[PDB]
Design a protein that fits this description.
This is part of a larger assembly, with two copies of chain A and two copies of chain B.
Chain A (H helix, E strand, L loop, with lengths): L2 E7 H19 L13 H4 L5 E4 L3 E4 L1 E5 L2 H9 L11 E3 L8 H7 L1 H17 L4 E9 L4 H16 L4 E7 L11 H13 L4 E5 L1 H10 L8 H15 L13 H8 L7 E5 L16 H6 L18 E9 L6 H12 L12 E5 L10 E8 L3 H15 L5 H5 L5 H20 L6
Parallel strand pairs in A: 1-4, 1-6, 4-5, 6-7, 7-8, 8-9, 10-11
Antiparallel strand pairs in A: 2-3, 9-12, 10-12
Chain B lengths: L2 E7 H18 L18 E2 L7 E2 L1 E5 L2 H9 L11 E3 L8 H7 L2 H15 L5 E9 L4 H16 L4 E7 L11 H13 L4 E5 L1 H12 L6 H15 L13 H8 L11 E3 L14 H7 L17 E3 L1 E6 L3 H11 L16 E5 L16 E5 L2 E2 L2 H18 L4 H4 L6 H21 L3
Parallel strand pairs in B: 1-4, 1-6, 4-5, 6-7, 7-8, 11-12
Antiparallel strand pairs in B: 2-3, 9-13, 10-14, 11-13
The chains are: A alpha/beta, B alpha/beta.
The complex binds guanosine-5'-triphosphate (2 copies), guanosine-5'-diphosphate (GDP) (2 copies) and magnesium ion.
The site of one guanosine-5'-triphosphate has 25 residues of chain B, from helix 1, helix 5 and helix 8.
PDB class: protein fibril
Keywords: Microtubule Tubulin Cytoskeleton Filament, protein fibril
Entry title: Xenopus tropicalis undecorated microtubule - 14 protofilament, 3-start helix
């Protein structure tokens, strides 16, 4: 029932994937060897939502790991948690992309994508009712940006009806860990707006801002940032895996959070977030929790929601809670910050409540937002792209792998329209 | 008296019903294991069997397996016939089109078969009680389907429903106006009368009268259980001046389209708070005629009452009910329309309520439920129509529907149909 | 009442019979060791002996030693007379020609001798029950042989059979159409009426009603055992309105060629699932008149019923059977042909079914088996004829037959004979 | 009852034979000394299907071993399992064929074939009901190709009615272990189409593709490839040796799998196949088993079934199983890949179920296929033959042993017709 098949591409995707499966195995109480050892019957009732079953209780998660070179996958297989995955699901090349979109999409990803599809179909046929596909990748890289967009299109063609959501790391506003991020970022968006139903944009700088600001843990390695991302994405799929008073669904969020087809880029949020030690001087009641979801300080997207306006918002609560407050606070929130929401939508907040909170907690709320302020990000990428493309800064690495600069112009023009479309809804009614 | 069939559609209807059927089990002393402990009433809502286990006469349908799975695995698993619990594979995802055109029809026929196999095994049959919501896919689209199908296969038999209407300001989904109006259009021509309820009003009551700060769905749906048991009390328990199921529509429906009587219940008092109250007939009768006591958050004084039923319960004094109602007819603030001087319908059943183990509400020796039909409800429709115009003016969510086999023109037809309903209330609100 | 002889030909018939004879042993309390534990009924199906060991009155023939060897070495080895178990040396290899012309005739005479030596030792004799398949060599070719030989030596005595008809889409051999049509042609003129069954329909029922996900041949052949025991219940057990064996053909065979009544049984319910069901007479009677309850996957509403027998079993109410049947005669969807207003044949035996140890089906206090003859079965023949035309048009498998003493023209004659049967159904499907 | 007499010719045949008898002795639980030591009574009920009995429980299998030189037979007699065979059944020459068809068929095989027939008849008269003959040989070689075709004709003349099936290794597509394979291969087919009822074509390259792809065992010696072949051939004869729900027969498969007389060349398949260690992360249910039978990856013939169309298919299952799935999956398979099957046959799948699975397993399915794609193999041999014969590349080694080049032309012409006949059924109905 509503099985999810997970796709992970690129070094960031695999590393987020690897952490992402540790938590779900923890939530369901699954041993690293693949043997269920939980304590709640509700963990087995829906264990098929992520995990296949082989005789003997060995639960094999249906994740598809693809990277153009064995580097990151070998670490996963050698990691403590790597024995759980099926050996076949790993798909590895012998020459990784050099961060360039073309090689990982056209010349190298093409030779490997067919191999991946051969395994994704086997996972699809093994599920009685495959809900949709989930992809974790990064726009900055080549393997995640290229093969993820190459593969997201191929699975789109075969299963147009199913949901296909994505979690992607987006270029930071002022720091860049790769010189050619705008080219890969712009090219990847063009291919995504046309094929993906929703995208949870995240960026490291915004997530860095969480580590030291609300938490107090200096030196947060990527292994910790991924945990925050891991927790948020596991919240979106909770209703599919545990009972609740007001169950949500991957399609439920898509219907509510996507007014128009193209404007499906969201930005997530999570709570409660508090540093260890200082945790005991704070309450865990619903009111303070809700305020933590509607402030820029707890936004994982570098864009500040204040500058823009909210279109649609979904709050997915967990744990035993008062449904009154779960809806009274949303009404007060909307009246307090009425200026932050557009007038042409009479109500914007979507509420869902689940019964089982996260492991080690008794309350949790994964915030999701669809605000016009994200246009600033894409506008910023447009600013960087036009600067570089105005002098053909690095086009020769791209055109040398079977590509034409005409595509770059097409992607830039499409990106500008996406920014324009968001802008048109800044204005009020009439 | 004879049988009734309860259909619970959608998460709200399915979740509400489980609380309702807990009352029926308690009132008749039926064990949750299904076996009656070692009389003529339960035949209406329960089917006999060779063994002592009675089978409830209801059907549960929900396209999302999760909600029914909880019931199918809960402690009440043995009570229900396994084939009555109909479950699909995927959810309707709050989309009206999915629950009515694409996936709703893939399982509707199976539901009809069990109802047909169930309606055929009752020597007598009164009608249907359909529990659902206005703000979901299965509870809105699948409902419209069954209203159509049940109307054809079992037309001219009563079709009642209890619908969770969208609250004025609190909202639990973004597309409530789109989905709320659509079901209204298709259900007007294939329904008798709808018992509207709002969680906002119920929450307002619960924190106000019941005096519990943190209510939940598991709490509110039980109060909705009380109105159902009081409404269906005549069909089960003996008492002076009974009111059969088919009687509700005649008194509460002056016109075919105008069949939206909001529910009101009294007295909602906690166990501790009750010791300082007397609960006289006028007291409970007066509680039903104020803005502070409604299951729908519509200010009654804005509009005019045009039909009211006071289904009294427990040990009651018919003399006082006659006297208590008379006083309410002679108050300026209360204003019945000019053309309905005969605006009351009393009903008494000698069975005081029963308390759910651990229930918040008190053990009142006497109870009353009011089902007034008022023109103030037009405000709820008027406000809802305003929301729909704002969104559809920008065509801001249509795309999710056109992709599920729903034509563009349906939205325009619905609102224009709702607009006529707005004018219909206005014409009835005046005198010729 | 007096004797009947059961002939089990082919792997299907032989394997089906072993399940059937397990019921007879249970019903009369006969030990698998053959010795009855320390009355007038078993004489019909069992032969007495000086010792307490009763000998079943049946013959088993299979050209492949493997199937009978399992019985001959199974725990039921002592039940059967050793000389009744006839085994050849080599299999028929799914070829109709081998089981009818070359190797079938090498052992047919031996089978006739034992039947003759068996029919001679019964003071009375009703007829024959022949169990076989349509998709094998021994069960198709050897059957045609015995129909011819038994018709000559014991003509004018009833010849009944239960045949596993080729399912619509699921297929267990490539040459089913070739072998299926051939046996039909030769058996039409030398048979009374055939009780068709399909594993597809039975599988569809088993996963649907019985609610077991993984059925097998050892499972399905038992349900086929129930229809046989219900059909032969009149010859053994006392009850009001008995139905002797010779009565079936008269009611179910309006025309000589049209003698293919498909079997339907009810109620198929598991032991656990039964506690929530009441099993009223109309309920079980209604189960037999829908597409969802057939042993042959033919949609009955496509065609029109022309004869129906309801052989009721167990403690039954003749008043209700009379009333229940009457309602089914006045439903528009159900459509009997114009020329048969008298379209029912009731039969009651006071012996509720018996459950095989470990059996999946429940311990129903009352049972019914329907043997309706419907024109919708023409679709099964029509579809089968389409398959044969496709293959024989390319002459794609004839060579395996011409090499076993079967002339080319036989294939053409069979289809042309089947084509006339198709038209024969069409003419009966209308009114003059 | 339905006794099988096994014939093995050539080095490949003897080596496959030698492994082939180890498994059957293992299945029936027969000690290498010839003394039965099994645990199931079903092993003795049919022990006469392969093994004769000499007083004292010494079961002597009725295999006939023929090679033109003592090389390979001496190894078998010296092998651990060699004591079981009757000393007389071994037939050995003193000058092996030099890979040339003529010497092993005309000048050297003729002097030895009469000796073999003298023993095959003794085996035939010792069986109450001799079902048929089974031959294991190779087309590439001289002894297997020549004396096998010489002997298959002689046994054909004496017992025309009986079944006579063969397992032969076929030249690989791109590698050749003998220079003159096309000459021996083409000559051997001409003599086989006219005398054999069915042929299970196999090739090492396709079987190599199994060893490392689905299994993970690098360095698979011939001793392991033969085991796969051993297992497949033992599956075909299972119903003759153990009970089942739907018993098969050597003649049953021939009737279903051979629409027209000449088109009797099949290509086998086996499952489950999974590498040790990784085996525990896979389920053994029927569904995943069936999909493994209808993919080129698990085909032991180098020809890929996708290029062509299936005519007839037989699946011989083993072990306790759900007959519903054993037939539900075939229906789904046919509708999924309807394009892969010809329209003029309304149904193509043949199902058989046995009760006793293979030793060390609880599920097994020996796939058999009759697809038009095999024409590519014979067409490839035709391409190689015409190239060599266009210049009389090696004809002098053949004409020097009592042969005329007219025979080569006859074999080439017949081979072309066989390819043409397969092609005619590529087209759809009407
Ligand atoms: N009174 C009451 N209302 C409920 C309950 N559950 C949900 N609701 C209300 O029902 C509406 C939401 O509809 P649901 O019933 O959850 O949705 P659904 O019918 O399952 O439709 P989909 O999930 O979209 O297919 C909201 O107005 C909720 O407040 C309940 O147990 N009791
Ligand atoms: N109901 C039922 N059907 C069976 C059984 N065994 C086989 N069949 C069906 O019978 C047909 C196959 O014919 P078989 O009876 O196995 O073949 P056979 O009569 O032994 O003929 P040959 O083996 O060709 O000589 C298929 O339709 C099977 O599904 C059984 O035990 N019960
Ligand atoms: N959150 C998170 N981000 C990462 C991690 N590793 C890399 N990234 C981000 O991913 C981008 C680099 O892409 P990468 O996946 O290494 O390139 P690819 O291998 O070509 O897809 C940069 O923006 C990094 O900040 C990680 O472990 N966690
Ligand atoms: N599967 C398998 N094939 C073999 C084996 N030995 C040889 N072959 C194949 O047989 C062919 C060589 O024929 P061979 O039997 O040695 O020649 P012969 O002795 O003249 O018949 C080549 O195609 C080899 O790949 C073996 O042990 N197993
Ligand atoms: Mg057989």
């Amino acid at each position: 029932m509503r099985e999810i098949v997970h796709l992970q591409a690129g070094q960031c995707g695999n590393q987020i994937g690897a952490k992402f499966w540790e938590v779900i195995s923890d939530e369901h109480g699954i041993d690293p060897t693949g043997t269920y050892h939980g304590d709640s019957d509700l963990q087995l009732e829906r264990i098929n939502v992520y995990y296949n079953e082989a005789t003997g209780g060995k639960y094999v998660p249906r994740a598809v790991l693809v990277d153009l070179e064995p580097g990151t996958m070998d670490s996963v297989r050698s990691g403590p948690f790597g024995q759980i995955f099926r050996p076949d699901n790993f798909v590895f090349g012998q020459s990784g992309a050099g961060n360039n979109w073309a090689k990982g999409h056209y010349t190298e990803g093409a030779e490997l994508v067919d191999s991946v599809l051969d395994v994704v179909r086997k996972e699809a046929e093994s599920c009685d009712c495959l809900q949709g596909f989930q992809l974790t990748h990064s726009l900055g890289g080549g393997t995640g940006s290229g093969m993820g967009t190459l593969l997201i299109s191929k699975i789109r063609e075969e299963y147009p009806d199913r949901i296909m959501n994505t979690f992607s790391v987006v270029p930071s506003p002022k720091v860049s860990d790769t010189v050619v991020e705008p080219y890969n970022a712009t090219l990847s968006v063009h291919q995504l707006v046309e094929n993906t139903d929703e995208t949870y944009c995240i960026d490291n700088e915004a997530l860095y801002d969480i580590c030291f600001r609300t938490l107090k843990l200096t030196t947060p390695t990527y292994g910790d940032l991924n945990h925050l991302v891991s927790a948020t994405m596991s919240g979106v799929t909770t209703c599919l895996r545990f009972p609740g008073q007001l169950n949500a669904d991957l399609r439920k969020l898509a219907v509510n959070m996507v007014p128009f087809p193209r404007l499906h880029f969201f930005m997530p949020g999570f709570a409660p977030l508090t540093s260890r030690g200082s945790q005991q001087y704070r309450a865990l009641t619903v009111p303070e929790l809700t305020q933590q979801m509607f402030d820029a300080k707890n936004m994982m997207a570098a864009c500040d929601p204040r500058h823009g306006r909210y279109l649609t918002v979904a709050a997915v609560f967990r744990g035993r809670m008062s449904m009154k407050e779960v809806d009274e606070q949303m009404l007060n929130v909307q009246n307090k910050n009425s200026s932050y929401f557009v007038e042409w939508i009479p109500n914007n907040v979507k509420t869902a409540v689940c019964d089982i909170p996260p492991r080690g907690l008794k309350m949790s709320a994964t915030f999701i937002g669809n605000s016009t302020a994200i246009q600033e990000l894409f506008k910023r990428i447009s600013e960087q792209f036009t600067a570089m493309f105005r002098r053909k800064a690095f086009l020769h690495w791209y055109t040398g792998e079977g590509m034409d600069e005409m595509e770059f112009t097409e992607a830039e023009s499409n990106m500008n329209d996406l920014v324009s479309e968001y802008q048109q809804y800044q204005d009020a009614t009439a | 008296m004879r049988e009734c069939i309860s259909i619970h559609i959608g998460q709200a209807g399915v979740q509400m019903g489980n609380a309702c059927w807990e009352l029926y089990c308690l009132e008749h002393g039926i064990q949750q294991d299904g076996i009656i402990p070692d009389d003529s009433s339960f035949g209406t809502f329960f089917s006999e069997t060779g063994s002592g286990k009675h089978v409830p006469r209801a059907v549960f349908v929900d396209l999302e397996q999760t909600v029914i799975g909880e019931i199918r695995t809960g402690h009440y698993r043995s009570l229900f016939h396994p084939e009555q619990l109909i479950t699909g594979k995927e959810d309707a995802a709050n989309n009206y089109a999915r629950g009515h055109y694409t996936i709703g029809k893939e399982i509707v026929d199976s539901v009809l078969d069990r109802v047909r196999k169930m309606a055929d095994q009752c020597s007598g049959l009164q009608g249907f009680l359909i529990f659902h919501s206005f703000g979901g896919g299965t509870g809105s689209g699948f409902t419209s389907l069954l209203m159509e199908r049940l109307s054809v296969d079992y037309g001219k038999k009563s079709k009642l429903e209890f619908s969770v209407y969208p609250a004025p300001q609190i909202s639990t989904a973004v597309v409530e106006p789109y989905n709320s109006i659509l079901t209204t259009h298709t259900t007007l021509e294939h329904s008798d009368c709808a018992f509207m309820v709002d969680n906002e009003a119920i929450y307002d009551i619960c924190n106000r009268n019941l005096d519990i700060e943190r209510p939940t769905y598991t709490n509110l749906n039980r109060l909705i259980g009380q109105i159902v048991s009081s409404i269906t009390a005549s069909l089960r328990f003996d008492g002076a001046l009974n009111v059969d199921l088919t009687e509700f529509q005649t008194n509460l429906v002056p016109y075919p389209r105008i069949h939206f009587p909001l529910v009101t219940y009294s007295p909602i008092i906690s166990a501790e708070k009750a010791y300082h109250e007397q609960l006289s007939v006028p007291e409970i009768t007066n509680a039903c005629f104020e803005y502070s006591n409604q299951m729908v958050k519509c200010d009654p004084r804005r509009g005019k009452y045009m039909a009211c039923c006071l289904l009294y319960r427990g040990d009651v004094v018919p003399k006082d009910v006659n006297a208590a109602i008379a006083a309410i007819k002679t108050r300026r603030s209360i204003q019945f329309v000019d053309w309905c001087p005969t605006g009351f319908k009393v009903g008494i059943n000698y069975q005081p309520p029963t308390v759910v183990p651990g229930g918040d509400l008190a053990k009142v020796q006497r109870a009353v439920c009011m089902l007034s039909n008022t023109t103030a409800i037009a405000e709820a429709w008027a406000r809802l129509d305003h929301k729909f115009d704002l969104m559809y003016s920008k065509r801001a969510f249509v795309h999710w529907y056109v992709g599920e086999g729903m034509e563009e023109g349906e939205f325009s037809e619905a609102r224009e149909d709702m607009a006529a309903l707005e004018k219909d209330y206005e014409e009835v609100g005046t005198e010729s």
